[PDB]
Amino acid sequence: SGSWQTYVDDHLMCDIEGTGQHLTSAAIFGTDGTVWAKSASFPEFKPNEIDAIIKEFNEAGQLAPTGLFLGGAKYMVIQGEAGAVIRGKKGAGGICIKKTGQAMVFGIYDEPVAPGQCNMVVERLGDYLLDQGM
Numbered sequence: 001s002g003s004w005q006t007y008v009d010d011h012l013m014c015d016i017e018g019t020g021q022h023l024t025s026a027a028i029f030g031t032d033g034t035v036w037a038k039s040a041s042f043p044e045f046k047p048n049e050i051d052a053i054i055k056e057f058n059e060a061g062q063l064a065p066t067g068l069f070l071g072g073a074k075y076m077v078i079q080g081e082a083g084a085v086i087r088g089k090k091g092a093g094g095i096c097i098k099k100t101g102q103a104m105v106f107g108i109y110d111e112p113v114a115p116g117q118c119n120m121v122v123e124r125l126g127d128y129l130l131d132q133g134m
């Protein structure tokens with residue numbers, strides 16, 4: 001593929017396991033905070049929000065006093081994997097973020113999608129990118 005957008009469209013925003021369900025939105029960022037690609041549905045994120053997530057991957061536990069904010073919306077942090085995966089919840093929806101060597105893979109989900117389905121989708125792409133040296 002010649003576009004980071006294809007990764008979003010064909011690995012993050014596609015029909016999950018043929019259930020007809022999809023992530024709400026998704027994105028791929030560089031570790032500097034540059035947007036490589038995002039779905040049109042992805043929220044109007046702010047640079048401090050992305051920087052907070054970059055910080056959390058470098059040292060887990062830093063989001064805790066405030067929450068995970070994205071597009072001004074507050075997610076409560078839920079169990080992740082230090083340095084590798086950050087997860088948050090907001091009602092029946094949530095967010096999952098997987099770190100690679102050079103990028104961060106974001107997925108946002110809502111009812112009826114389950115938290116573990118978001119994790120599957122995001123983590124599988126991230127692991128692919130890691131196997132490709134990214």
Ligand code: NA
Nearest residue numbers: 040041042043
């Ligand atoms: Na919008």
